[PDB]
Design a protein around this ligand. Structure first.
Ligand SMILES: CC1(C)C(=O)C=C[C@@]2(C)[C@H]1CC[C@@]13C[C@@]4(C)C=C5C(=O)OC[C@]51[C@@](C)(C[C@@H]23)C4=O
Ligand SMILES: O=C(O)CCC(=O)C(=O)O
Ligand SMILES: [Fe+2]
Lengths: 268, 277
């Protein structure tokens, strides 16, 4: 197992094989630079933080899908995300949906993040085998370059196959993920990973998406979003963000409105 | 293991011990006659116009041709959402079932359980079969869900009263279905409640009487599992009239896992702070 970097046109079956063998990979040019920049600009325009000028004469961050039209209209429809999620969660769990998504702004001077698996906050990971499907998957998209010096994510290829209770990987066995703007690192919930120290004078920036099986409760709820935004989402994204009924592998539906579909009861 | 009939004032510790040992029990006088009638009055028109059988096709064919199982009880019954979902027995048992391992719990689903005269016996099943992760679970682990089946009409053998198999919750996930001769019918007057952890093998019986047999149910499961029923379609003034507890139960508040980790959150803060709840 190694850290693989693959082009955008890599066949899906290759990507899933690499995920199975090494537990992680990078898809180069996952997004164009303009798209990842657009999410940042829309986030900045939402929070409207005051930035002083040279001399004298605001909202708190919320869901990325609420702050960024590009995130909810373009990013969450990314075909690579759904191609992988369909194959990772589909055969066992049926539908999947959005787990959580955050802006990554690694501050200069931040030290090394502890090495961890993402599925630790699922109590059922204590029951899961390494051969089972993953409990969640994360897509980390680079806005700025990911370098060794600015604290880019580090992975340990193959550590997703380790048994439960296995010791953390050694610091020297971590592999830095070197990414250009628009690249994306695929992080299944079983991959041990950590952010490095930002020993530069500039921010390391990016954002994440994550998805997990329909029968698990997402980190984030989007129920507070204005109806106008929901109605402009694709049906796929409406399902991703908790506005539609989900189908289990046994065809039983969850997140229903009574015995019917949520979207029929809300008038979507 | 045995099927026990206990009074309402049974200490919580005895109820938990019976659930651990025998996998089920009946709590008599769980609701009073006033609550039984108020629920029956609020759901009368609803169940009558409801069409029997399952509404959609799925792999669990345990809804017979003469069975009506309508849900959406919080939308259709004020007493369900303002009082029943606040029931102290449900929350006391749920906190001790899911708390130490999962943290918060919330509402899973809740159906009317109405047997028309002539309905045949339901297939014997565990309620948590529709969780893929029950295959991963071991019998000594906490349950994935728990059900409270409350009698609205009397529950008798001949009217299709629920049947359980005490001690079948401790079977391994590969164990075959209990034999029909192994099932124990339960006896309930209106307002009695049968407690059904998701691992207990149970089924409704055949309604060989001239009167329908009706119950209704609540069910709760850990905060990290997706409820079978959403409630985001309910009107806001309904939500504002709920207690904050029932508000959490029905998915209008952020949930706390077992390690200061929150799920069902609005970006950074809580969902309730984002909607002005
Ligand atoms: C298909 C059926 C008949 C079954 O064979 C086994 C489990 C489920 C899927 C029911 C229908 C709906 C549920 C969904 C719910 C959350 C609330 C309902 C209920 O109140 O009674 C049936 C349920 C149950 C107790 C069992 C569960 C439950 O877990
Ligand atoms: O109606 C009953 O008594 C039992 C119904 C049931 O077990 C079920 O629907 O899963
Ligand atoms: Fe059941």
């Amino acid at each position: 197992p190694q850290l693989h970097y693959v082009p955008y046109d890599t066949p899906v079956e290759d990507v899933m094989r690499i995920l199975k063998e090494s537990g992680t990979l990078v898809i180069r040019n996952f997004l164009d630079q303009n798209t990842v920049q657009k999410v940042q600009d829309e986030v900045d325009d939402y929070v409207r933080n005051w930035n002083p000028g040279p001399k004298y004469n605001t909202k708190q961050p919320s869901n990325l899908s609420l702050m960024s039209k590009t995130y909810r209209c373009e990013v969450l429809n990314h075909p690579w995300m759904h191609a992988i999620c369909e194959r990772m969660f589909g055969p066992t769990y049926g539908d999947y949906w959005f787990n959580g998504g955050s802006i990554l702004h690694l501050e200069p001077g931040e030290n090394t993040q502890p090495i961890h698996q993402d599925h630790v906050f699922y109590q059922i990971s204590k029951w899961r085998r390494p051969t089972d499907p993953d409990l969640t998957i994360n897509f980390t998209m680079a806005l700025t370059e990911f370098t060794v010096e600015n604290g880019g994510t580090r992975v340990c290829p193959g550590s997703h196959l380790w048994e439960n209770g296995h010791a953390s990987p050694a610091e020297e066995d971590m592999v830095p993920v070197l990414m250009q703007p628009g690249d994306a690192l695929i992080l299944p919930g079983s991959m041990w990973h950590s952010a490095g120290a930002n020993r530069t004078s500039e921010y390391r920036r990016g954002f994440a998406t994550s998805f997990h099986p329909c029968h698990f409760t997402p980190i984030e709820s989007h129920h507070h979003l204005p109806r106008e935004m929901v109605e402009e989402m694709t049906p796929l994204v409406q399902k991703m963000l908790g506005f539609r009924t989900l189908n289990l592998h046994n065809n039983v539906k969850v997140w229903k409105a009574g015995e019917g579909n949520l979207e029929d009861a809300t008038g979507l």
